Amino acid sequence: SVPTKLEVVAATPTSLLVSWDAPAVTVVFYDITYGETGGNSPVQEFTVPGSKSTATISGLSPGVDYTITVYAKYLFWSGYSSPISINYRTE
């Protein structure tokens, strides 16, 4: 049971809105990490309630390739879903 259709639905040169479709399994929270592709700068991490299917990432730099990764933590089962990631270039 893994989330699908990860994509950016809106962007400014400093912010993204990312969305996904929830799996059938009950999710307690989604763990999200984002950072410069290639690891020039360190990543940042946060969590989003399992009742949400979007996330807003702020404070980005124009013209920079970012990698956004999403894990889903299962409410009643151990571990996480397999991570899903996308690349997006602001400007």
Partner 1 sequence: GSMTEYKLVVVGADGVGKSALTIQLIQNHFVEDSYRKQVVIDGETSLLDILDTAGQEEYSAMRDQYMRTGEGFLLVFAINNTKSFEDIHHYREQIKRVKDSEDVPMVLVGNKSDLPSRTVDTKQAQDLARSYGIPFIETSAKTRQGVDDAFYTLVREIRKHKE
Ligand X SMILES: OC[C@H]1O[C@H](O)[C@H](O)[C@@H](O)[C@@H]1O
Query: Which of partner 1, ligand X, none is residue 14 near (CB under 5 to 8 Å by kind)?
Result: none
Residue of 25, 26, 31, 36 lying closest to 88 (CA atoms): 36
Cα–Cα distance measured from residue 8 to residue 56, given in angstroms and rounded to the nearest whole number: 10
Q: Which is nearer to ligand X, 25 or 80 (CB)?
A: 80
Q: How far is the CB of 66 from partner 1 (least distance, A)?
A: 23
Task: Identify the residue among 6, 8, 25, 84 touching partner 1 (CB under 8 A).
Answer: 25
CB closer to partner 1, 23 vs 86: 23
The Cα 51–Cα 38 span in angstroms is 31
Type of residue numbered 15 = S
* 56 binding ligand X? (CB under 6 A): yes
* 77 sits near ligand X (criterion: CB under 6 A): no
Q: Given the complex with ligand X, which of 25 and 69 has the nearer CB atom?
A: 69
From CA 3, how far away is CA 6, in angstroms rounded? Answer: 8
